[PDB]
Amino acid sequence: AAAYWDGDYYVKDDGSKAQSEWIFDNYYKAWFYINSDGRYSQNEWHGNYYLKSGGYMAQNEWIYDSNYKSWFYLKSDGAYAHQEWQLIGNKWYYFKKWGYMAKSQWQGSYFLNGQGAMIQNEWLYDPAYSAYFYLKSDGTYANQEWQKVGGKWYYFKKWGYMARNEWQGNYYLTGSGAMATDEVIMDGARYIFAASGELKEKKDLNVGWVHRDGKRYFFNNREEQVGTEHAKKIIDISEHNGRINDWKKVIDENEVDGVIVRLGYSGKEDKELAHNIKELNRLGIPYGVYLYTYAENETDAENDAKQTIELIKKYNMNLSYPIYYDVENWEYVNKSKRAPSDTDTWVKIINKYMDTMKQAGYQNVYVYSYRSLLQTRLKHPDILKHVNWVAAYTNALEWENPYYSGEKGWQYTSSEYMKGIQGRVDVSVWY
Ligand SMILES: C[N+](C)(C)CCO
Ligand SMILES: C[N+](C)(C)CCO
Ligand SMILES: C[N+](C)(C)CCO
Ligand SMILES: C[N+](C)(C)CCO
Ligand SMILES: C[N+](C)(C)CCO
Ligand SMILES: C[N+](C)(C)CCO
Ligand SMILES: C[N+](C)(C)CCO
Ligand SMILES: [Cl-]
Ligand SMILES: [Cl-]
């Protein structure tokens, strides 16, 4: 025996201490870097190599470096992988310049997940491109082709963008991207598809707001009249519609009878509320208001009512339509919290909001929600008695409420285009 460790120092085959050099220890079967001070490197990098705790050079292994806040992979010769792909534990990883593992990002036509692994047979919504992509079996994005995914057909355009609300040859991609296999009503027409997706027939329809025999009516997509000649066209607006440049233009050109204006959501005022109220008041356009709730309990509900009342007085609101508690299956952007799923909690929440508003002197207060929620979570006599504005973007509402009787609204669309407004608009028929 000749060469040996002496504390932090290494004595070579001769009598001399190692200095500024790599040594291979046959006992450990490992490489070590000895520094200019004669001591082994550990828990640190030397050029392309990482020396682990105790000095051992990393080889064929992952290292997480807390200083760089990144994973690195040391190859068979110990050098860090960089600007290259590596197959490790039967998954593909990509290493960027300086060895940083790619994560939650594209590398050309491939996408690396939060763990660094190349994704395969997976949907990806990328906010950076504002669209859906599908990573195929080989990891590359679907491109200028059909893919059958989860038992349904989707079409991918140039650069991988999932087709939606559009045609591809004889096939129509619906809003979810899924190929139409039934019927689609659009363009004032009914499109009938084979179960296999090819268009079979188009039939023109009597639908929407129609002026007929000297009067105006609303027809649902089943070609059924909703209400009478006095049916009203009500839009609902928020900061999400942007700044409305010319309110009078919107009203006249689109024959709009009234507006429900977003107050905001629990704890925050809508950015366009001040402007919208100023203009609607100035022009004497009839309006009501709504608040999107993130309530979890009666305390939140009371706070919602307090907020509502504060805003009404602040902006001198003149309410021709009701105050609406907009109740949906809410979820925090960060997913930390979501709406209570039980009916009894919502009975408490909704009635606390109503009671608080009523005690404050506001007697024209109702609930808005979606048909699906009203059939399930919100299906209770003490909730339904307050519901007179229902959303269902369907061919007919086909929903009865035994607990409310009187004037009511059906929000039949969130995709209408109107003169004087940028982008899509929510519209209701009031009857
Ligand atoms: C491997 N060293 C000898 C350098 C340290 C472990 O005792
Ligand atoms: C090159 N080293 C000596 C640093 C180790 C094995 O490649
Ligand atoms: C691996 N890094 C390049 C990030 C540091 C070592 O030189
Ligand atoms: C170590 N990674 C998390 C980077 C990949 C292996 O699961
Ligand atoms: C290594 N690549 C990612 C380029 C191909 C594996 O499918
Ligand atoms: C999928 N895109 C082509 C749009 C970007 C990533 O390569
Ligand atoms: C594209 N998906 C099928 C994942 C849903 C779209 O909303
Ligand atoms: Cl390297
Ligand atoms: Cl619904």
Side-chain angles (χ1 to χ4, degrees), residues 82-132:
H82 67 284
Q83 297 178 114
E84 73 188 309
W85 288 90
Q86 297 278 294
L87 181 65
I88 310 161
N90 201 48
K91 291 184 176 176
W92 281 104
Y93 298 86
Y94 183 77
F95 299 88
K96 303 179 292 186
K97 193 174 180 182
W98 299 290
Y100 293 90
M101 185 191 73
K103 68 171 183 180
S104 296
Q105 68 190 119
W106 293 91
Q107 175 56 24
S109 64
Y110 302 92
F111 192 87
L112 297 315
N113 69 19
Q115 299 289 162
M118 177 190 74
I119 65 177
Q120 302 167 77
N121 308 297
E122 280 187 47
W123 285 109
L124 172 72
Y125 184 83
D126 192 344
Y129 296 95
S130 298
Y132 283 98

Short mmCIF file of all heavy atoms in Angstrom, two decimals, residues 82-132:
data_model
loop_
_atom_site.label_atom_id
_atom_site.label_comp_id
_atom_site.label_asym_id
_atom_site.label_seq_id
_atom_site.Cartn_x
_atom_site.Cartn_y
_atom_site.Cartn_z
N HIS A 82 -25.36 18.97 -21.29
CA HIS A 82 -25.72 20.33 -21.69
C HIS A 82 -25.98 20.41 -23.17
O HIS A 82 -25.32 19.73 -23.97
CB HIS A 82 -24.63 21.33 -21.29
CG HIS A 82 -23.36 21.15 -22.04
ND1 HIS A 82 -22.46 20.13 -21.77
CD2 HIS A 82 -22.81 21.86 -23.06
CE1 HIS A 82 -21.43 20.23 -22.58
NE2 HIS A 82 -21.62 21.26 -23.38
N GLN A 83 -26.95 21.25 -23.53
CA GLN A 83 -27.38 21.44 -24.92
C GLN A 83 -27.58 20.09 -25.61
O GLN A 83 -27.13 19.86 -26.74
CB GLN A 83 -26.39 22.35 -25.68
CG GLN A 83 -26.35 23.75 -25.09
CD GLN A 83 -25.35 24.64 -25.79
OE1 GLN A 83 -25.72 25.62 -26.43
NE2 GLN A 83 -24.08 24.30 -25.67
N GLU A 84 -28.26 19.19 -24.91
CA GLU A 84 -28.43 17.83 -25.40
C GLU A 84 -29.55 17.10 -24.67
O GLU A 84 -29.94 17.47 -23.56
CB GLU A 84 -27.11 17.05 -25.24
CG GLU A 84 -26.80 16.69 -23.81
CD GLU A 84 -25.41 16.12 -23.67
OE1 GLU A 84 -25.07 15.18 -24.43
OE2 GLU A 84 -24.65 16.61 -22.82
N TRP A 85 -30.05 16.05 -25.32
CA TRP A 85 -31.06 15.15 -24.75
C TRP A 85 -30.37 13.97 -24.08
O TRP A 85 -29.32 13.51 -24.54
CB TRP A 85 -31.97 14.63 -25.87
CG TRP A 85 -32.88 15.67 -26.41
CD1 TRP A 85 -32.65 16.53 -27.45
CD2 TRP A 85 -34.19 15.97 -25.92
NE1 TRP A 85 -33.74 17.34 -27.65
CE2 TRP A 85 -34.70 17.02 -26.73
CE3 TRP A 85 -35.00 15.44 -24.91
CZ2 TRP A 85 -35.98 17.57 -26.53
CZ3 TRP A 85 -36.27 15.99 -24.70
CH2 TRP A 85 -36.74 17.04 -25.51
N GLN A 86 -31.00 13.45 -23.03
CA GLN A 86 -30.52 12.25 -22.33
C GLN A 86 -31.71 11.37 -21.96
O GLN A 86 -32.72 11.87 -21.47
CB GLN A 86 -29.77 12.64 -21.05
CG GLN A 86 -28.50 13.45 -21.27
CD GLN A 86 -27.33 12.57 -21.63
OE1 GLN A 86 -26.86 11.78 -20.80
NE2 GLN A 86 -26.84 12.70 -22.85
N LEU A 87 -31.58 10.07 -22.21
CA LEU A 87 -32.58 9.10 -21.79
C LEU A 87 -32.16 8.58 -20.42
O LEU A 87 -31.13 7.91 -20.29
CB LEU A 87 -32.68 7.95 -22.80
CG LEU A 87 -33.71 6.86 -22.53
CD1 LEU A 87 -35.14 7.40 -22.60
CD2 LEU A 87 -33.53 5.70 -23.52
N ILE A 88 -32.94 8.92 -19.40
CA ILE A 88 -32.60 8.58 -18.02
C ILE A 88 -33.81 7.98 -17.33
O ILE A 88 -34.89 8.57 -17.33
CB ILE A 88 -32.13 9.82 -17.22
CG1 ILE A 88 -31.05 10.60 -17.98
CG2 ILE A 88 -31.62 9.39 -15.84
CD1 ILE A 88 -30.87 12.03 -17.49
N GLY A 89 -33.62 6.80 -16.74
CA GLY A 89 -34.72 6.07 -16.10
C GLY A 89 -35.92 5.93 -17.03
O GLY A 89 -37.07 6.10 -16.60
N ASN A 90 -35.63 5.64 -18.30
CA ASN A 90 -36.63 5.43 -19.35
C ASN A 90 -37.50 6.65 -19.68
O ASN A 90 -38.62 6.51 -20.19
CB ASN A 90 -37.49 4.19 -19.07
CG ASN A 90 -38.15 3.66 -20.32
OD1 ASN A 90 -37.50 3.50 -21.36
ND2 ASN A 90 -39.46 3.40 -20.25
N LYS A 91 -37.00 7.85 -19.39
CA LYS A 91 -37.68 9.07 -19.81
C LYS A 91 -36.65 9.99 -20.45
O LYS A 91 -35.45 9.90 -20.15
CB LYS A 91 -38.38 9.76 -18.62
CG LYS A 91 -39.59 8.96 -18.09
CD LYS A 91 -40.33 9.69 -16.98
CE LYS A 91 -41.59 8.90 -16.56
NZ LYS A 91 -42.31 9.52 -15.39
N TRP A 92 -37.13 10.85 -21.35
CA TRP A 92 -36.25 11.81 -22.03
C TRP A 92 -36.20 13.13 -21.29
O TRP A 92 -37.23 13.67 -20.90
CB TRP A 92 -36.70 12.03 -23.47
CG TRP A 92 -36.30 10.93 -24.40
CD1 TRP A 92 -37.11 9.95 -24.90
CD2 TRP A 92 -34.99 10.69 -24.93
NE1 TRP A 92 -36.38 9.11 -25.72
CE2 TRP A 92 -35.08 9.55 -25.76
CE3 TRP A 92 -33.75 11.33 -24.80
CZ2 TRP A 92 -33.98 9.03 -26.45
CZ3 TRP A 92 -32.64 10.82 -25.49
CH2 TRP A 92 -32.77 9.67 -26.30
N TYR A 93 -34.99 13.67 -21.15
CA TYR A 93 -34.76 14.97 -20.52
C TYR A 93 -33.90 15.81 -21.46
O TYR A 93 -33.09 15.27 -22.22
CB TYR A 93 -34.03 14.82 -19.17
CG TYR A 93 -34.86 14.02 -18.18
CD1 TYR A 93 -34.81 12.63 -18.17
CD2 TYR A 93 -35.71 14.67 -17.28
CE1 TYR A 93 -35.59 11.90 -17.29
CE2 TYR A 93 -36.50 13.95 -16.39
CZ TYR A 93 -36.43 12.57 -16.40
OH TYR A 93 -37.22 11.85 -15.53
N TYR A 94 -34.06 17.12 -21.38
CA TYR A 94 -33.24 18.03 -22.18
C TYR A 94 -32.48 18.96 -21.24
O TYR A 94 -33.06 19.50 -20.30
CB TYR A 94 -34.08 18.84 -23.18
CG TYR A 94 -33.17 19.70 -24.02
CD1 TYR A 94 -32.44 19.13 -25.07
CD2 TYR A 94 -32.99 21.06 -23.75
CE1 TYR A 94 -31.55 19.90 -25.84
CE2 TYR A 94 -32.10 21.84 -24.50
CZ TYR A 94 -31.38 21.25 -25.54
OH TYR A 94 -30.52 22.02 -26.29
N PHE A 95 -31.20 19.14 -21.53
CA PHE A 95 -30.35 20.01 -20.72
C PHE A 95 -29.92 21.21 -21.51
O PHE A 95 -29.40 21.08 -22.62
CB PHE A 95 -29.18 19.20 -20.17
CG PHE A 95 -29.63 18.07 -19.30
CD1 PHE A 95 -29.94 16.83 -19.86
CD2 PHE A 95 -29.84 18.28 -17.93
CE1 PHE A 95 -30.42 15.78 -19.04
CE2 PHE A 95 -30.33 17.24 -17.11
CZ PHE A 95 -30.61 16.00 -17.67
N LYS A 96 -30.16 22.38 -20.92
CA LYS A 96 -29.90 23.64 -21.59
C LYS A 96 -28.43 24.04 -21.47
O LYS A 96 -27.61 23.27 -20.96
CB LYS A 96 -30.84 24.71 -21.03
CG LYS A 96 -32.31 24.31 -21.19
CD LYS A 96 -33.30 25.33 -20.63
CE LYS A 96 -33.22 25.42 -19.10
NZ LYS A 96 -34.30 26.32 -18.56
N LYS A 97 -28.08 25.22 -22.00
CA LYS A 97 -26.73 25.75 -21.85
C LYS A 97 -26.40 25.80 -20.35
O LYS A 97 -27.27 26.08 -19.52
CB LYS A 97 -26.61 27.13 -22.49
CG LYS A 97 -25.17 27.62 -22.64
CD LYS A 97 -25.12 28.93 -23.42
CE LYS A 97 -23.69 29.42 -23.58
NZ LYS A 97 -23.64 30.74 -24.30
N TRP A 98 -25.15 25.47 -20.03
CA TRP A 98 -24.65 25.42 -18.64
C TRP A 98 -25.26 24.28 -17.80
O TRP A 98 -25.06 24.21 -16.58
CB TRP A 98 -24.81 26.78 -17.94
CG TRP A 98 -24.05 27.89 -18.60
CD1 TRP A 98 -22.68 28.04 -18.64
CD2 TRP A 98 -24.60 29.00 -19.31
NE1 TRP A 98 -22.36 29.19 -19.33
CE2 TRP A 98 -23.51 29.80 -19.75
CE3 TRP A 98 -25.90 29.41 -19.61
CZ2 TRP A 98 -23.69 30.98 -20.49
CZ3 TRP A 98 -26.09 30.58 -20.35
CH2 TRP A 98 -24.98 31.35 -20.77
N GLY A 99 -26.01 23.39 -18.45
CA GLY A 99 -26.46 22.15 -17.81
C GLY A 99 -27.82 22.20 -17.12
O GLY A 99 -28.30 21.18 -16.63
N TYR A 100 -28.43 23.38 -17.07
CA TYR A 100 -29.73 23.51 -16.40
C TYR A 100 -30.79 22.59 -17.04
O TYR A 100 -31.03 22.68 -18.24
CB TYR A 100 -30.22 24.96 -16.43
CG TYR A 100 -29.38 25.92 -15.61
CD1 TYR A 100 -28.29 26.57 -16.18
CD2 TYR A 100 -29.68 26.17 -14.27
CE1 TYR A 100 -27.51 27.46 -15.43
CE2 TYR A 100 -28.91 27.06 -13.51
CZ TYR A 100 -27.83 27.69 -14.10
OH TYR A 100 -27.07 28.57 -13.35
N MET A 101 -31.40 21.71 -16.25
CA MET A 101 -32.48 20.86 -16.78
C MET A 101 -33.65 21.70 -17.29
O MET A 101 -34.13 22.58 -16.57
CB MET A 101 -32.96 19.87 -15.72
CG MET A 101 -33.98 18.89 -16.27
SD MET A 101 -34.75 17.95 -14.94
CE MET A 101 -35.82 19.20 -14.19
N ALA A 102 -34.10 21.43 -18.52
CA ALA A 102 -35.32 22.09 -19.05
C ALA A 102 -36.52 21.58 -18.26
O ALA A 102 -36.62 20.38 -17.98
CB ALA A 102 -35.50 21.79 -20.54
N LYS A 103 -37.43 22.48 -17.92
CA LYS A 103 -38.63 22.10 -17.19
C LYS A 103 -39.77 23.05 -17.51
O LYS A 103 -39.56 24.26 -17.68
CB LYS A 103 -38.38 22.04 -15.67
CG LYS A 103 -38.12 23.38 -15.03
CD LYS A 103 -38.10 23.24 -13.50
CE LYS A 103 -37.91 24.59 -12.84
NZ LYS A 103 -37.89 24.46 -11.35
N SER A 104 -40.97 22.48 -17.59
CA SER A 104 -42.19 23.25 -17.88
C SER A 104 -42.01 24.20 -19.06
O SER A 104 -42.36 25.38 -19.00
CB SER A 104 -42.64 24.02 -16.63
OG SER A 104 -43.00 23.09 -15.61
N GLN A 105 -41.42 23.67 -20.14
CA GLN A 105 -41.09 24.51 -21.28
C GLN A 105 -40.87 23.67 -22.53
O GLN A 105 -40.63 22.47 -22.44
CB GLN A 105 -39.83 25.35 -21.00
CG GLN A 105 -38.55 24.51 -20.88
CD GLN A 105 -37.38 25.32 -20.38
OE1 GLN A 105 -36.81 25.04 -19.32
NE2 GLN A 105 -37.01 26.35 -21.12
N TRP A 106 -40.97 24.31 -23.69
CA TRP A 106 -40.71 23.63 -24.96
C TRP A 106 -39.22 23.48 -25.22
O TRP A 106 -38.40 24.30 -24.76
CB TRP A 106 -41.30 24.43 -26.13
CG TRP A 106 -42.78 24.47 -26.15
CD1 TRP A 106 -43.58 25.42 -25.57
CD2 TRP A 106 -43.66 23.54 -26.81
NE1 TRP A 106 -44.91 25.13 -25.82
CE2 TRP A 106 -44.99 23.99 -26.58
CE3 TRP A 106 -43.46 22.38 -27.57
CZ2 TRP A 106 -46.10 23.30 -27.08
CZ3 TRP A 106 -44.58 21.70 -28.07
CH2 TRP A 106 -45.88 22.17 -27.81
N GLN A 107 -38.88 22.45 -25.98
CA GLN A 107 -37.57 22.33 -26.61
C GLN A 107 -37.87 21.92 -28.04
O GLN A 107 -38.04 20.73 -28.33
CB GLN A 107 -36.68 21.28 -25.93
CG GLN A 107 -35.35 21.07 -26.65
CD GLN A 107 -34.53 22.34 -26.84
OE1 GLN A 107 -34.68 23.31 -26.09
NE2 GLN A 107 -33.65 22.33 -27.83
N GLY A 108 -37.98 22.92 -28.92
CA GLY A 108 -38.40 22.64 -30.29
C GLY A 108 -39.82 22.11 -30.31
O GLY A 108 -40.74 22.78 -29.82
N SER A 109 -40.00 20.92 -30.86
CA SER A 109 -41.36 20.36 -30.99
C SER A 109 -41.78 19.49 -29.80
O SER A 109 -42.85 18.86 -29.83
CB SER A 109 -41.49 19.56 -32.28
OG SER A 109 -40.62 18.47 -32.23
N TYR A 110 -40.92 19.46 -28.78
CA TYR A 110 -41.14 18.65 -27.57
C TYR A 110 -41.42 19.54 -26.37
O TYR A 110 -40.99 20.70 -26.34
CB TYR A 110 -39.91 17.79 -27.27
CG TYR A 110 -39.53 16.86 -28.41
CD1 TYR A 110 -38.60 17.26 -29.39
CD2 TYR A 110 -40.09 15.59 -28.51
CE1 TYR A 110 -38.25 16.40 -30.44
CE2 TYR A 110 -39.76 14.73 -29.55
CZ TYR A 110 -38.84 15.13 -30.51
OH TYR A 110 -38.51 14.27 -31.54
N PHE A 111 -42.13 19.00 -25.38
CA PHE A 111 -42.41 19.77 -24.16
C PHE A 111 -41.97 18.98 -22.93
O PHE A 111 -42.28 17.80 -22.81
CB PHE A 111 -43.89 20.13 -24.06
CG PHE A 111 -44.19 21.15 -23.00
CD1 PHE A 111 -44.11 22.51 -23.28
CD2 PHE A 111 -44.52 20.74 -21.69
CE1 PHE A 111 -44.38 23.47 -22.29
CE2 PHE A 111 -44.78 21.69 -20.70
CZ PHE A 111 -44.71 23.06 -21.00
N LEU A 112 -41.24 19.65 -22.05
CA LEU A 112 -40.75 19.03 -20.80
C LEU A 112 -41.67 19.43 -19.67
O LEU A 112 -41.96 20.62 -19.51
CB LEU A 112 -39.32 19.51 -20.50
CG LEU A 112 -38.19 19.17 -21.48
CD1 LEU A 112 -38.23 17.72 -21.93
CD2 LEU A 112 -38.20 20.10 -22.71
N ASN A 113 -42.13 18.46 -18.88
CA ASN A 113 -43.01 18.76 -17.75
C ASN A 113 -42.27 19.36 -16.53
O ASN A 113 -41.06 19.65 -16.61
CB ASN A 113 -43.89 17.54 -17.37
CG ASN A 113 -43.09 16.39 -16.76
OD1 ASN A 113 -41.97 16.58 -16.28
ND2 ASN A 113 -43.69 15.20 -16.75
N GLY A 114 -42.98 19.55 -15.42
CA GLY A 114 -42.39 20.18 -14.22
C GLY A 114 -41.30 19.34 -13.57
O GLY A 114 -40.50 19.86 -12.76
N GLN A 115 -41.26 18.06 -13.92
CA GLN A 115 -40.24 17.12 -13.44
C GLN A 115 -39.11 16.94 -14.46
O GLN A 115 -38.18 16.16 -14.24
CB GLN A 115 -40.85 15.75 -13.13
CG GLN A 115 -41.94 15.77 -12.05
CD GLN A 115 -41.41 16.02 -10.65
OE1 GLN A 115 -42.17 16.38 -9.75
NE2 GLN A 115 -40.10 15.82 -10.44
N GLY A 116 -39.22 17.68 -15.56
CA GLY A 116 -38.23 17.63 -16.63
C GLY A 116 -38.49 16.58 -17.70
O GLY A 116 -37.83 16.58 -18.73
N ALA A 117 -39.45 15.68 -17.48
CA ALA A 117 -39.65 14.58 -18.43
C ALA A 117 -40.39 15.04 -19.68
O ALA A 117 -41.36 15.80 -19.61
CB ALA A 117 -40.41 13.45 -17.76
N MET A 118 -39.91 14.57 -20.83
CA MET A 118 -40.60 14.81 -22.10
C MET A 118 -42.02 14.21 -22.01
O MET A 118 -42.18 13.06 -21.63
CB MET A 118 -39.84 14.14 -23.25
CG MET A 118 -40.52 14.26 -24.60
SD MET A 118 -39.75 13.24 -25.87
CE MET A 118 -40.29 11.61 -25.41
N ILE A 119 -43.04 15.00 -22.34
CA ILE A 119 -44.41 14.47 -22.27
C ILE A 119 -44.81 13.75 -23.55
O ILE A 119 -44.39 14.13 -24.66
CB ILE A 119 -45.45 15.54 -21.84
CG1 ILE A 119 -45.57 16.66 -22.88
CG2 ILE A 119 -45.09 16.13 -20.47
CD1 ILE A 119 -46.64 17.69 -22.52
N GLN A 120 -45.60 12.69 -23.40
CA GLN A 120 -46.08 11.90 -24.53
C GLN A 120 -47.54 11.57 -24.29
O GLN A 120 -47.95 11.32 -23.14
CB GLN A 120 -45.28 10.60 -24.66
CG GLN A 120 -43.78 10.81 -24.83
CD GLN A 120 -42.99 9.53 -24.63
OE1 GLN A 120 -42.93 8.67 -25.51
NE2 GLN A 120 -42.34 9.41 -23.47
N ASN A 121 -48.34 11.59 -25.36
CA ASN A 121 -49.76 11.28 -25.27
C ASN A 121 -50.45 12.16 -24.23
O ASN A 121 -51.15 11.67 -23.34
CB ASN A 121 -49.98 9.80 -24.95
CG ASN A 121 -49.23 8.88 -25.90
OD1 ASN A 121 -49.49 8.87 -27.10
ND2 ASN A 121 -48.28 8.13 -25.36
N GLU A 122 -50.24 13.47 -24.35
CA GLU A 122 -50.78 14.44 -23.40
C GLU A 122 -51.18 15.76 -24.04
O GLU A 122 -50.48 16.30 -24.91
CB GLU A 122 -49.77 14.74 -22.28
CG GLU A 122 -49.70 13.71 -21.17
CD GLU A 122 -48.81 14.18 -20.03
OE1 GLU A 122 -48.95 15.34 -19.58
OE2 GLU A 122 -47.96 13.39 -19.57
N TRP A 123 -52.30 16.28 -23.58
CA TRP A 123 -52.71 17.65 -23.87
C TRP A 123 -51.82 18.62 -23.13
O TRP A 123 -51.39 18.36 -21.99
CB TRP A 123 -54.13 17.90 -23.38
CG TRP A 123 -55.18 17.28 -24.22
CD1 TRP A 123 -55.96 16.21 -23.91
CD2 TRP A 123 -55.57 17.70 -25.53
NE1 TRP A 123 -56.82 15.93 -24.94
CE2 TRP A 123 -56.60 16.83 -25.95
CE3 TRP A 123 -55.16 18.74 -26.39
CZ2 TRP A 123 -57.24 16.96 -27.20
CZ3 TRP A 123 -55.78 18.86 -27.64
CH2 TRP A 123 -56.82 17.98 -28.02
N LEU A 124 -51.58 19.76 -23.76
CA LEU A 124 -50.94 20.87 -23.09
C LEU A 124 -51.63 22.17 -23.47
O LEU A 124 -51.76 22.49 -24.65
CB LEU A 124 -49.46 20.94 -23.49
CG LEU A 124 -48.68 22.17 -23.02
CD1 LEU A 124 -48.43 22.10 -21.51
CD2 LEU A 124 -47.39 22.28 -23.80
N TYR A 125 -52.08 22.91 -22.46
CA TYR A 125 -52.49 24.27 -22.71
C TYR A 125 -51.29 25.15 -22.37
O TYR A 125 -50.82 25.14 -21.24
CB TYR A 125 -53.71 24.71 -21.89
CG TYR A 125 -54.12 26.11 -22.30
CD1 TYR A 125 -54.92 26.31 -23.42
CD2 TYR A 125 -53.67 27.24 -21.60
CE1 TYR A 125 -55.28 27.57 -23.83
CE2 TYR A 125 -54.03 28.52 -22.00
CZ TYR A 125 -54.83 28.68 -23.12
OH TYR A 125 -55.20 29.93 -23.54
N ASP A 126 -50.80 25.89 -23.36
CA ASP A 126 -49.69 26.79 -23.12
C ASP A 126 -50.16 28.24 -23.19
O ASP A 126 -50.46 28.75 -24.28
CB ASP A 126 -48.56 26.54 -24.11
CG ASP A 126 -47.27 27.24 -23.72
OD1 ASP A 126 -47.31 28.17 -22.87
OD2 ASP A 126 -46.21 26.87 -24.27
N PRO A 127 -50.22 28.92 -22.02
CA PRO A 127 -50.64 30.33 -21.96
C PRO A 127 -49.74 31.25 -22.79
O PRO A 127 -50.21 32.28 -23.27
CB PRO A 127 -50.53 30.67 -20.47
CG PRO A 127 -50.59 29.35 -19.77
CD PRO A 127 -49.90 28.38 -20.69
N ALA A 128 -48.47 30.86 -22.95
CA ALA A 128 -47.52 31.62 -23.77
C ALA A 128 -47.94 31.71 -25.24
O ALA A 128 -47.59 32.67 -25.94
CB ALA A 128 -46.12 31.03 -23.64
N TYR A 129 -48.67 30.69 -25.71
CA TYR A 129 -49.20 30.66 -27.08
C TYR A 129 -50.73 30.79 -27.10
O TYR A 129 -51.34 30.89 -28.17
CB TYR A 129 -48.75 29.37 -27.80
CG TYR A 129 -47.25 29.25 -28.01
CD1 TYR A 129 -46.45 28.55 -27.10
CD2 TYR A 129 -46.62 29.83 -29.12
CE1 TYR A 129 -45.07 28.43 -27.29
CE2 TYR A 129 -45.23 29.72 -29.32
CZ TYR A 129 -44.46 29.02 -28.39
OH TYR A 129 -43.09 28.88 -28.56
N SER A 130 -51.33 30.79 -25.91
CA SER A 130 -52.79 30.90 -25.73
C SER A 130 -53.56 29.88 -26.57
O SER A 130 -54.46 30.24 -27.35
CB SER A 130 -53.29 32.32 -26.01
OG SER A 130 -52.71 33.26 -25.11
N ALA A 131 -53.20 28.61 -26.43
CA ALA A 131 -53.87 27.54 -27.19
C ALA A 131 -53.55 26.17 -26.66
O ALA A 131 -52.63 26.00 -25.85
CB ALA A 131 -53.51 27.63 -28.66
N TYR A 132 -54.32 25.18 -27.12
CA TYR A 132 -54.03 23.78 -26.83
C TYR A 132 -53.14 23.14 -27.89
O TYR A 132 -53.29 23.40 -29.09
CB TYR A 132 -55.32 22.96 -26.74
CG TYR A 132 -56.07 23.15 -25.45
CD1 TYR A 132 -57.14 24.04 -25.37
CD2 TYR A 132 -55.70 22.44 -24.31
CE1 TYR A 132 -57.83 24.22 -24.17
CE2 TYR A 132 -56.39 22.61 -23.11
CZ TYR A 132 -57.45 23.51 -23.05
OH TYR A 132 -58.13 23.68 -21.86
#
